[PDB]
Write a protein that binds this ligand. Sequence first.
Ligand SMILES: [Ca+2]
Lengths: 70, 70, 70, 213
Amino acid sequence: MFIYYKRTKQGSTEQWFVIGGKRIYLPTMTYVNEANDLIKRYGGNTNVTTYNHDNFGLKMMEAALPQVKV
Amino acid sequence: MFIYYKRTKQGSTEQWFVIGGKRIYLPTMTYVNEANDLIKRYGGNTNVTTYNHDNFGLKMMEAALPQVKV
Amino acid sequence: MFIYYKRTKQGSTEQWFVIGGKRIYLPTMTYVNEANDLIKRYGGNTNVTTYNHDNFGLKMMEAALPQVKV
Amino acid sequence: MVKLNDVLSYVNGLVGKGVDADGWYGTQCMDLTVDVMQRFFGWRPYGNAIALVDQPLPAGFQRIRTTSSTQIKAGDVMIWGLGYYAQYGHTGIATEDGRADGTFVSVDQNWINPSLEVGSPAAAIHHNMDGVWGVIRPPYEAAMFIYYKRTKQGSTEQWFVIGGKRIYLPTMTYVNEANDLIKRYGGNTNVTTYNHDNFGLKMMEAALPQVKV
Ligand SMILES: [Ca+2]
């Protein structure tokens, strides 16, 4: 489990959570707090890196880790 | 998260990246370098082993880890 | 990644390999050896436990980890 | 595994200060118990103090109704649940074995100069047994994970995460077997309770499909 940031085409910076081989967009503070708490509980990785939307590392993560909503 | 090499039946060597229970053929060195950077960031395994195409360990990985594309 | 033993209803002992969220039945000692080399390479767990076919820990692993055939 | 002296050093070190574990009403009684249990055992007890009487407990924990102070051991989580305390309860940590004269010593918040709004600092209190229900005895030395879910209807379910899936555990034998898996395969022994509407839980439930056993 971990969180990363994505610098999007339109210039915003988005928080994303990887858990269960999936990724969850964290749109608001409330999501972000809860995800950080999961990381602390379950020994998630605390590296926070920012990826530009066209970074290949990001592309590989996005191909491998389906997105799930809410 | 780790990378392995595969020597194919026709004699070329392929680099493959395991992430999220999936495997990704790494088509260029830029993809390789970004995979290595993911491994370092997220505490992936740095073992690099080459498997001949017929190897049973490779066949088990290839059965258990679906391929995703990029 | 780990191996476990299953005592089946008919009283044979099967070796199974957990990898990538999947379970693989190991049909011959060559498969078992290759599985153990994978464990060693990739930092897998070296615990081997023997489960009777009606053990609820076994039942929960079989439900959660789909079988794939090599 | 956890050393009693570590807990007691930490608890005695809090005397005169306060901890706020939840961000509500400053340093209440449950805040102390929750802090200590989270730091040392990776367990976040749920609810007010009185919910310690019957909420599920992590592997290795024991709960005992106490008739006598002599049953209290150092490092026990004390529970008040009788009389005035039946509504909300009180809690704190036993720093010594209970004494033969019917008394014991615990470090508690919000006992001395109690406050509904801001609670009060941890103090070492010589108590009697008035209102005491019993103890939770954590597993101390020498003497894949599970989570709990508090349902809309007011029950607490135990759930097991394994292989990117989640399994509802129907009985305590299922619980025991999942804890055995955790032990064998180096799972995480953290235990937390989520209310059914918690976003952490919603993310987990969306990411980890349910499978049945
Ligand atoms: Ca508080």
